[PDB]
């Protein structure tokens, strides 16, 4: 009766945004990203990539509830480096990593194929 539609797990119906920004007030230079209609597949990547940055203090993510398809990521940087720019830099480094991985996988497959 109440089983949610399967497509709901990733689609965005009209009335919500993919990203919303919230400035945490507890500690200065902190942000609370609220990526929507995603899951651990992205949260783990984002946490791992952010944690590698030398100039970011805190980085983590949580799903508020497994049934609700939402994730919250908190990032705290030094007082000279906005969290939004850290997020963007992490994403760009990620894109470069995945493009390089795809290219090298192509090379490996071509080499294996005679």
């Amino acid at each position: 009766m109440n089983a949610p539609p399967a497509f709901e797990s990733f689609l965005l119906f009209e009335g919500e945004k993919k990203i919303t920004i919230n400035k945490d007030t507890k500690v200065p230079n902190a942000c609370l990203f609220t990526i929507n209609k995603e899951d651990h597949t992205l949260g783990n990547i984002i946490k791992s990539q952010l944690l590698k940055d030398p100039q970011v203090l805190f980085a983590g993510y949580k799903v508020p509830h497994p049934l609700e398809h939402k994730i919250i990521i908190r990032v705290q940087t030094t007082p000279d480096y906005s969290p939004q720019e850290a997020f963007t830099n992490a994403i760009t480094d990620l894109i470069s990593e995945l493009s390089l991985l795809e290219e090298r996988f192509r090379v490996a497959i071509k080499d294996k194929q005679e």
């Binding site: 030398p54 100039q55 203090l57 030094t78």
Partner: protein, 148 residues
Amino acid sequence: AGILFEDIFDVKDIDPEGKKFDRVSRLHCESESFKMDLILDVNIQIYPVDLGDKFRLVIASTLYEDGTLDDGEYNPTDDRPSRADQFEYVMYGKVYRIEGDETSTEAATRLSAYVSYGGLLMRLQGDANNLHGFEVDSRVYLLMKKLA
């Protein structure tokens, strides 16, 4: 210079009561000069240790060696003051009790200080003249390094 205790120690017993915990061992040590019995708990997998090993212990209120208080926050990017990083294995916690041999009328002759580093404890027996630096409910650091 913020150093609350300077002494060289030697370890005789790795764990007299047995291997209670896998990754922790209770070192029993005494000094060479001050004659100060020392009990201490130390991570093993992170930092190997065996019998007959000579090290020098240091306990300071701050690692900055400038007198300025740290206020107890984690800041890996604040390495500018060149904290006491010479020593090889560092741990951090607060003292919680200070027993002694005080009588009703006589001042203490031997002061025993207990400290808790998030579970890993010590016991520092010795003369009161060597332990007056400690004050109950005060944050302190532990410092370690091997000697030839």
